[model samples]
Target: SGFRKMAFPSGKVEGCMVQVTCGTTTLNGLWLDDVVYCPRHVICTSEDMLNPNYEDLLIRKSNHNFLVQAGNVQLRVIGHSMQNCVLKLKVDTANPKTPKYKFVRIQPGQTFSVLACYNGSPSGVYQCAMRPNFTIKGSFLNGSCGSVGFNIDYDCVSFCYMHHMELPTGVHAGTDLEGNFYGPFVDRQTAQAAGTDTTITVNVLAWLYAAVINGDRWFLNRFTTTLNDFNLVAMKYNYEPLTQDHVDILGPLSAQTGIAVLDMCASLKELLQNGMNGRTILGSALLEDEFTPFDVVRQCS
Candidate 1:
């Protein structure tokens, strides 16, 4: 028999009980500055300094913090150590009639955003093909937002800014990764000020990552050890106090949906099972319907 599946029966989980795990994310920051990586509303990352194409996107005198220089909507993800990620853009080949596109590096940043054309009324255009090579683990935007599709389509960011922001399903964490749009508001004060009070699944798994000592047996179904060869690490709950930036998405959600903090209670397996079943987590409820077993890969992969 594989690892025994524990039972909570009471099904009541609390916020201060358990912890979310994490792992170090590796990336490549050395860029030639040929591209841009800013999403529409947020500031830019360090890589944008050399790229002349996106200079129009940057806010004047703000250095490379806000707006753009000149370019379609480029994108980058926040959380994890992905600021070194390269955002690429698609350019046209010679034949306008035949119509072909090519991809070159776009932008990079600590925020999850699309490379928007800053001239869009001070607004800008985004390309459908513009995206990152690595995967990002976050909730799907379809719940409170509209469908932006996987490709960044023309004028997509223009009319699609209400109630939703598009996100690439990346490598398909299963669940309902169907739609492309993601995010309610990147900031909490604004998200709560106008908060409509709709609860959705938030992927807190990234906070709890694989480590060696006091680790966990996550991500594996217990027996498919054949396909589950990632034994280099072990999944463990992060016991340290949560940091500020990490709490942005989880904090507000706890006020509305459920809490992210929890105790092991000797039910690490049982707790995760409940989380996976879309039932209760922490001091309230969380949904696994928006997330899935495959999503575990999105954390460290």
Candidate 2:
């Protein structure tokens, strides 16, 4: 007749170590030592003295979710799952291009908070999401254990603007081997205002260099034809036809290898030049042979 009270103030009671006297009897009128009692019934038998509510405890403490908050532009998680769980949180802010991740352990009915710095604020507000990684069968608060998104206000002070440049108009003039006069090179502003710059003047050697950098054999062919056309035109003027051999002797001019611009332009030009060289058959053939412009461009660099 030494049974203990089993009814609890709440819904379910767990982990109660019970000891009985010599003439002990459970709520179910069964004599037992170290029994776990439930409402109106004895749950733990003599065979299950150590863990009477194993399955019940597991079902009660399963994977769940929680609410979130912000502490002055920072991030925080509020435990509302009523069960202990670990949260895998990923945070993205406007300022940093990269996102950050953290693993936070939240106890039942508790809160966890974090921030980048005390006085610092991200370029934009903070956006965060979380998912709990725990095993559970029964349903938890807020449905299933999945990611949740939350945002925090940010005090951003940086501003953006556009830069304007006033470039002066420029002009350039040149002539071909055929005595055909060509442009005055013009600046972008002058070209835009006049709706025209220089006419198509075949600068064979200059164009050959362009072909070399662009890896465009078709350009080489066009410019070579232009040189041949120039030769035909020059024959009418009693001038010697410009041959590929003539072109071959112009040592690496400021116009030939784009050597002058190498120092003035960004490294991107050098990188593109290198890439074009690798793709061409004549990677190092800069004005050294009397071959077809196309052959010189496609074969020797």
Candidate 3:
């Protein structure tokens, strides 16, 4: 067993041979703590006679996530000498009068971090921007597995922030054009395309920070709404707590918003426990009644 740990922009194979198994240490058990390995890189095109080789180990390793192998010669070359690309973050909180925007450049083969914050203290539309120069080429670290909001304590302490994103309404395809269209409620391609519009807005009042603990507060900045019915966008519990109370806050908050909280917990828990990350947990409430802002408060005064 070899000790392997990895982050964005690279995966395990690194363009060579020797498929990595697993382990956290040079002493076998030492690297036991490290579970994720860098992935492999391969080139595929539509122009030729297609072929698949089971012996070509690289094919077995790549995934939606980036992988990396420790001390692997093949992975080393790919990491050090891949394409030179840049990373960036985009923020859109949808206040027509005064929109907010910021970005940072991402260096080649580097894992970048970012924070998207909401501006107003109201309830409305909000959106985030991640128009990297590489488009779909790079990966992001919103947080660790089993964590929220950049994987920090302040945010992860409660499920509130993550609960408020504009999720999908769970309706789908196989319907006639004029028959109450709700085709594929959870489409990523559509979500991405819809989000590209400048008209999107951020809801400034998610109450994530009002219950801050450990001297830190959680905030939800961008909200994506077009993610179809199968996917849920995450706002992330964005901050690390410095005290025990901070950790305690998550429970009660989660309990209070049982509907949203429970759902978010299930979403976050899957990512953390399974080492999976950044999956959209789609949710939507269908109602036959008319829309009203007051309806959002349900029973509140």
lDDT over C-alpha atoms for residue 104 of model 3 = 24
Q: State TM-scores per candidate.
A: 0.20, 0.14, 0.19
Model 2 TM-score, 2 decimals: 0.14
State the lDDT at 142 in candidate 3. Answer: 19
lDDT of 2 by residue, 1-301 (tens): 1111111121000111111111121211100121111111012235543434434533343112211112223322221111111112222222222122222222111111111111111111111111111111111121111211111112211111000111123211211111121222221123222122221111233334444555544222211234555555444433334545444433343354543322212222232234345343233433211222332232334
Better candidate number, 1 or 3, judged by lDDT: 1
lDDT of every model, 2 decimals: 0.23, 0.23, 0.20
Ranking by lDDT: 2, 1, 3
lDDT of 1 by residue, 36-60 (tens): 2222212233344233333354224
After superposing candidate 1 on the true structure, give the runs of residues whose Cα lies further than 4 Å from its correct spot.
1-234, 237-244, 258-269, 273-301
Q: So what's the TM-score on candidate 1?
A: 0.20
Clash count for candidate 3 is 43
Runs in model 2 lying further than 4 Å from the true structure: 1-204, 222-229, 234-301
Where model 3 places Cα greater than 4 Å from the true spot, the runs are 1-32, 37-149, 155-301
lDDT per residue (tens digit) for residues 1-301 in model 3: 1111211111111111122221221100001112211111122122211342323433333332222233332122222111111101111111122212112232111122211212111112221121211111112221111111111122221111111112232211111111111222221113512122110001111122112211222222222223221123222222111122322433444445432333333333233234323322111111111111111122121
